[PDB]
Design a protein around this ligand. Structure first.
Ligand SMILES: Cc1ccc(CC(=O)Nc2cnccc2C)cc1
Ligand SMILES: Cc1ccc(CC(=O)Nc2cnccc2C)cc1
Lengths: 304, 304
């Protein structure tokens, strides 16, 4: 028992981190097989950042300008190319520590672990969700660009995020591993609207099931609701509308606890309308939306 | 910017995890150099657990009864001994992945990362604090025993905790790496009082400094207080009394923000007396005590 904001073990990803320097700029790169992936803004200077012409900036660079160091050892760069907002530096040596891996584009509301890195060295690991507005609320400082987000499926690392920038609001934006930004963001120092965000309803319900499994039951009530009624409440409180697809993915948790999904929706409805009255759920005084139904099952079963 | 409950990268510890089986019981072991450390209750059965005579149970075991598997490969056990509540199994091969390491006994209120494991395989990593009452509020299921807590100082892993048991209250108890329990706990299936716990005041103040650094400032007020006055409030709200030693370790954060420690104490006093009024601090609706002043500085500076 107990329920924590648990990240995947970061070892397989630590073995892929390298430092990439181009001119005066240094950030992190991800070395998988014989390619190093990093944010293309490694080729910019401060003057360039209002609206960089990445194509022109990259044309001024040669393979020898990209300095890649895997901890202590230097990698020899034999090719470079830009794909969307990432650079791919072909190196002459395949990373001996390359795990089995996939590049995936995650959906808003899904969760992943981030290995925050500086100068190619891992600093820490934390779990977070891709917000419905495609931002992440991470913990990143200057030099963290190129740090990645991922999930692990037994021996396979699915890389889903590469960190690119901090918005003026202090929230974070980045790309999938093909360099496509999540959300409307561009890699320019410009003020950029992140859409209206919402609370990930299916994750809050999954977390209420995790609470029941671990003995926090005070919020269970004698009520039920319908998807239509629940969605009027979700609307008022800026929660994502719940669909049958969300009810279906909560099926395992509903079966394990014997609490029908719509009955858990009625508990969530009352918590939204009444608040917590100074009480806590799994050590939190707010409704947590950073655990998916898969995360709750995985944590509550002991998946290695 | 941003502030997360960040754990240390778990790679150096993942390389030390093994599975230990004795008879019908399986748990995790920590393989450092040519020794595997694991909880001594690996030698018990269900009948034995009300009050095991560990000395007698161990006498019935030989080196060949301890099956140790490092992922896929079997280790040859050439010695066994019990030290307090841990067993030390001497193996004929030094772990090639042994990091630089130390065994340390942490103080109540200090934090560490846990790598939860099952059957010698890492499941996830999370950050937590050793409660003032020497329990930890972890996330552990049956089979997680032998999972360890640690901190990392550049290249050195300081192991501070090995998981042994779950109390009937759902909180966790374990030992340092010499097998001494933290707190009054014994490795028996008996109901056991965990002392009265308190909130780690110095950590809450460190976290209020982290909030100011990241822009959450609403709780700052026009007041100041004294250690004596602040401690009357801490007393009433079950917080640890603040000492000059705690004020001194908050010195760096006070210098960075320009907010005198006693002025931050007056903000904490008002939050204790008035609550949050439905507001949040660093995404939390309660006062967080799982970040030490060192953790806040480390996270806010980017230590790898
Ligand atoms: C368009 C663009 C891209 C990158 C940069 C640097 C940047 O944002 N680094 C950063 C990332 N995450 C957290 C804190 C910081 C400072 C500037 C402009
Ligand atoms: C004295 C003693 C020691 C160990 C055990 C098993 C045990 O507590 N395992 C466990 C640990 N952490 C979380 C959940 C579980 C079930 C029983 C009795």
């Amino acid at each position: 028992s107990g329920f924590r904001k648990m990240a995947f073990p970061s070892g397989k990803v630590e073995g892929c981190m390298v430092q990439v320097t181009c001119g005066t700029t240094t950030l992190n790169g991800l070395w998988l097989d014989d390619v190093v992936y990093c944010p293309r803004h490694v080729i910019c200077t401060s003057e360039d950042m209002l609206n960089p012409n990445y194509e022109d900036l990259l044309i001024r660079k040669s393979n020898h300008n990209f300095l890649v160091q895997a901890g202590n050892v230097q990698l020899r760069v034999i090719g470079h190319s830009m794909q969307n907002c990432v650079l791919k530096l072909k190196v002459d040596t395949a990373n001996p520590k390359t795990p089995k891996y996939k590049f995936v584009r995650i959906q808003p509301g899904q969760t992943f672990s981030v290995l925050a890195c500086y100068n190619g060295s891992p600093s820490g690991v934390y779990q977070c969700a891709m917000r419905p507005n495609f931002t992440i609320k991470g913990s990143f400082l200057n030099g963290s660009c190129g740090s990645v987000g991922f999930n692990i499926d037994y021996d396979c690392v699915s890389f889903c995020y590469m960190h690119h920038m901090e918005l003026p609001t202090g929230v974070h934006a980045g790309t999938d591993l093909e360099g496509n930004f999540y959300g409307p963001f561009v890699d320019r120092q410009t003020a950029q609207a992140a859409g209206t965000d919402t609370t990930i309803t299916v994750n809050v319900l999954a977390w209420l099931y995790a609470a029941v499994i671990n003995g926090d039951r005070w919020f269970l009530n004698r009520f039920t609701t319908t998807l239509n009624d629940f969605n009027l409440v979700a609307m008022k409180y800026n929660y994502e509308p719940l669909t049958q697809d969300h009810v279906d993915i909560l099926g395992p948790l509903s079966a394990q606890t014997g609490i029908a999904v719509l009955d858990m929706c009625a508990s969530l409805k009352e918590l939204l309308q009444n608040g917590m009255n100074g009480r806590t759920i799994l050590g939190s005084a707010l409704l947590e939306d950073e655990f998916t139904p898969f995360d709750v099952v995985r944590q509550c079963s002991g998946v290695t």
